């Protein structure tokens, strides 16, 4: 979640029915637009920011939210246009004996500005005397790895979280029938009625 992967999605048709009707995404709600209503509205740039967090702070991925991930790792802005998909991933990410590949930023001088990606792993100074990048008292490495175990509870299981953000080449689809000949039809071709 500190190095959250962002991929820009554009110049395509975005079919959201396979997302909402997948029946596998446990946490899913949408801000600024209804999830069944965004299928037939068109945006310009779509960013799919994706990361892995513990199941407790899925609530931290929300606009106007204060916490640890929402301040030092990944902050959503208050005017967030888009939405968040989080599903359980205990069967893949929590390996036997502990999974320590996933780390989160724990110590930081200031809270993050929205959509900031912080990659620096400098030894954080919490006190007055600087300690030149060596480990010690008031010298904390800011990335504390999650302890992910299959023994862990539901709140401690890893949840793969994908965050969609929206802003005109990004959209849904349609049709209806066959073409109808030699009968009075009040047709609709591309919008022309």
């Amino acid at each position: 979640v500190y190095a959250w992967n962002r991929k820009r999605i554009s110049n395509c048709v975005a079919d959201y029915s396979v997302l909402y009707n997948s029946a596998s995404f446990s946490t899913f709600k949408c801000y600024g637009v209804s999830p069944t209503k965004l299928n037939d509205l068109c945006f310009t740039n779509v960013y799919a920011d994706s990361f892995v967090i513990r199941g407790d702070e899925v609530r931290q991925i929300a606009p106007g939210q204060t916490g640890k991930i929402a301040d030092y790792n990944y902050k959503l802005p208050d005017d967030f246009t888009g939405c968040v998909i989080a599903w359980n991933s205990n069967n893949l990410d929590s390996k036997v004996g502990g999974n320590y590949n996933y780390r989160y930023r724990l110590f930081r001088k200031s809270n993050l500005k929205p959509f900031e990606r912080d990659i620096s792993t400098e030894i954080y100074q919490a006190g007055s005397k600087p300690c030149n990048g060596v480990e010690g008292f008031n010298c904390y490495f800011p990335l504390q790895s999650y302890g992910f175990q299959p023994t862990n509870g539901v709140g401690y299981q890893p949840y793969r979280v994908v965050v969609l953000s929206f802003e005109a080449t990004v959209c849904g689809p349609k049709k209806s029938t066959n073409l109808v000949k030699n009968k009075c039809v009040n047709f609709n071709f591309n919008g022309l009625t």
Epitope: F107, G127, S128, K129, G136, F137, Y140
Partner: antibody
Amino acid sequence: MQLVQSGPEVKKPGTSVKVSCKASGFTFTNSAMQWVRQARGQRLEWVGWIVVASGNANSARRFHDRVTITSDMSTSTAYLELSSLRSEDTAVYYCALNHCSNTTCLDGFDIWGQGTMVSVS
Amino acid sequence: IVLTQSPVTLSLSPGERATLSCRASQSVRNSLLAWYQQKPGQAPRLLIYAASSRATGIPDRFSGSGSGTDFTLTISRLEPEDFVVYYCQQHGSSPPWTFGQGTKVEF
């Protein structure tokens, strides 16, 4: 701004102790508690220290394998359990905390506990 | 890294000038030799932090001076309640944030 510590535990040379130390008046930030063991009539010693936000404990060399110094941010506590509780362990155990003034932290273990007469009988 | 302190008792009169010094055997990194006092059998409390600075809430009459290995605790005005065992710190190194032997401020 006070560290309420648990009461005394009269124990046996085969048992193990469990010393807790709750922080009252505030919550644990990146505060770096240390633990000080004082045998009566001797100098203060050093057991180990927890970065409370991270949980990275680190114990002293004579205590390298038989004390685990754990912390819990949810209850705003920080624990200690010492193994095998020998006859040369009858002491008073002090949980010392570094005060963090949000914007930063201090460089001194200013707020302490009150003691825990861990008796080995 | 071990820390040796200097005279094991300060057996001299109240109400005058006394000097307390911690002669470290290895050079203290980043000058972190905080000074504590501990009246016998009760909780210690902090006087000097970062080897020179006066602590918050603590009044005057104490002074930490110097850095590195040469070091001084400067007590100005020995009241009767300052006749206490006084302690070093080395919480700067890594492990064994070694204390001192202490001393005895004695009448």
